[PDB]
Amino acid sequence: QWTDQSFIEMMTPHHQDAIDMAEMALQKAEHPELKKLARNIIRDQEREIKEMKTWYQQWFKRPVPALAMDLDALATAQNFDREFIRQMIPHHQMAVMMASNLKTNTERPEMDKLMDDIIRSQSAEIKQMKQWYQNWYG
Ligand SMILES: [Cu+]
Ligand SMILES: [Cu+]
């Protein structure tokens, strides 16, 4: 059962990985649909990281401590877009399934709004990537 603290500790680098892949995609992606996604992942998940880091400080009197994606496998992948989606889909799935779990445990209104946002946007992005993968590679 996830608590507010351990969730943020895990979700922070998880979001950071997505941002890092999305930044790489601004350079290496071919399909414009993918770059529009990346620009959204960057904007929306940097904002959530910033909030998680803030809340963590406010609630736990210290910054988020530190110590799932393979960015070198993506960098040297023969087909960037295919490997982006192949990694970003299950990555988003962990986010969704976790956000749903914490949703029924947390008592903080900040986390409850955050869970809904994750569940909402990331599920939608999954639907887009599934569709793109079918059109480009199906
Ligand atoms: Cu994340
Ligand atoms: Cu993701």
CATH code (residue 88): 1.20.1260.10
Contacts of 26 (CB under 8 A, 6+ apart): 35, 38, 39
Listed residues: CB within 5 A of ion ligand 1: 14-15, 95
Number of domain units in the chain: 1
Q: How many CA atoms lie within 13 A of 73 on its CB side?
A: 10
From ligand 1's centre to the CA of 91, what distance in Å?
A: 8
- Enter the tokens of residue 60: 């736990």
Is there a contact between 71 and 24 (Cβ–Cβ < 8 Å)?
yes
Q: Which domain holds residue 137?
A: 1-138
Phi, psi values for residue 112, rounded to 5°: -70, -35
Q: What is the resolution of this structure in A?
A: 2.5
Q: What's at 96, amino acid-wise?
A: V
Buried b (16+ CB within 10 A) or exposed e, 98-135: bbeebbeebeeeebeebbeebbebbeebbeebeebbee
Calpha distance 74→47 (Å, rounded): 25
